[PDB]
Amino acid sequence: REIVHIQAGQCGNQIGAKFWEVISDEHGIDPTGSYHGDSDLQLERINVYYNEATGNKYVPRAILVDLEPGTMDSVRSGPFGQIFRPDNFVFGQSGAGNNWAKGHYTEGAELVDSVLDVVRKESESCDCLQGFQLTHSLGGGTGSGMGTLLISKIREEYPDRIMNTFSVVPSPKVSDTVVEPYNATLSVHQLVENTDETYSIDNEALYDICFRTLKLTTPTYGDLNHLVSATMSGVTTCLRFPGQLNADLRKLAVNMVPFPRLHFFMPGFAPLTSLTVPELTQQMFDSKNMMAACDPRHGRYLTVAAVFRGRMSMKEVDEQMLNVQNKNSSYFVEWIPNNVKTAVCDIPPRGLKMSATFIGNSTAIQELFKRISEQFTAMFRRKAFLHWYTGEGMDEMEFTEAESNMNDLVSEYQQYQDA
């Protein structure tokens, strides 16, 4: 019915600013100006991402949070920078961190309020707030730490409404840092408690996805962000578009998540870089094409959701779809009946005549988590860089206590390869 978008922390901000300028140009929106596109649909559900202001004009429900200038004035001065409402930019000023605690306790809580006082403004403004979605990094601090807090402070203020996040789960290849496992594990914990669904964009997949499969030698944060931006348009489509379904996003949740421990979706995409239907599915359900670094093979699908894009006959889709869950019949749990559903919206993405996107609650996502607690226990082992948090005011055992919660999550997933 209507959703606000929080977008915090260098990585978060980057992603979101690409998100925005993809969908904005899908609905047909100027840098500021309103509609320009000989389509019509667009404006049906434009409502959901776009609180509108003075005259024509269209402005995205968006709160931009960060603990240091730069990366905001990177947006402001660039793509669709004139778009976001000016006092919707919540500057940090201070140190950032690249350290959870800073963002979740000392330098973060410093701000939080000032953000929360503007999320309040957009949400309390909304005709019927559906929920918030948030974008950020899991490793490093001002997105992972402030975020996990924004949400922890968003629920409580709206237990009512549901929580949605795109969280970029990081890796050794492609990092700002040593310390992330720490930051990741400290969030993954926070995530599993206060959100309802999270999309795991694994940077590791994204990388493998640009070098194993995309000719690109050293990937920027650019061609690479590029992938998320496309996947995110994909995931959201049928909230913001047609009259196929309607997708309360609550509906999306209460249909995708069997078990309260907010299970993390690994997304996927169809065509890529910067298409026959059979050749679309077999690709969208290929591991080498997942947005999270797993191989949905070691482990099964709890529930799946696939959403296709472009004027193609769904005669062929139902049929291709049921056909994947046949040549792969064993890897869809058989205790949840029709646990793969499909939808068709026929308004193409960027270039791209065909396309699909894929959302998957898969126990194989365990492989991801295990591999971040892997380099975690290897570090917190002999209490490595820990004195970076110790001193900012954290307890020794808040790490074990997080490490151990996460370990559980791994072993509930590992459980649901049941019978």
Binding site: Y105, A109, S152, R155, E156, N194, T390, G391, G393, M394
Partner: protein
């Protein structure tokens, strides 16, 4: 047979007479019983005031079906009204204090931000 006839009486408008033909040869209505007519009269008021106070039998058995229904209805109405509403204060009490079993488990990892930042203004 050759007759021998003796004449009795010779009126003005008639004659009678005996004629033997062959000598023969050989050698309380009481009133009391009308009490037997009010003996009917009171066997016939029985007959009736029976199969009358016997159709007065089936009579207010009508008062009965026309009741075991109406009474049967208010037993359903005024029974599954609180078989609803008392499963719906049952509901409120269950979430209305579970949305608050969510809140107090938060305000706790919260009153914990303060009690370990008022420990960072004590540390290094």
């Amino acid at each position: 047979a050759d007759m021998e006839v003796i004449e009795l009486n010779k009126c003005t408008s008639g004659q009678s007479f005996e004629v033997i033909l062959k000598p023969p040869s050989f050698d309380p209505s009481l009133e009391e019983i009308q009490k037997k007519l009010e003996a009917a009269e009171e066997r016939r008021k029985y007959q009736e005031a029976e199969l009358l106070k016997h159709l007065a039998e089936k009579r207010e058995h009508e008062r009965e079906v026309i009741q075991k229904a109406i009474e049967e209805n208010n037993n359903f109405i005024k029974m599954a009204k609180e078989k609803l509403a008392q499963k719906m204060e049952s509901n409120k009490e269950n979430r209305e204090a579970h949305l608050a079993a969510m809140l107090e488990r938060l305000q706790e990892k919260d009153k914990h931000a303060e009690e370990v930042r008022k420990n960072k203004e004590l540390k290094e």
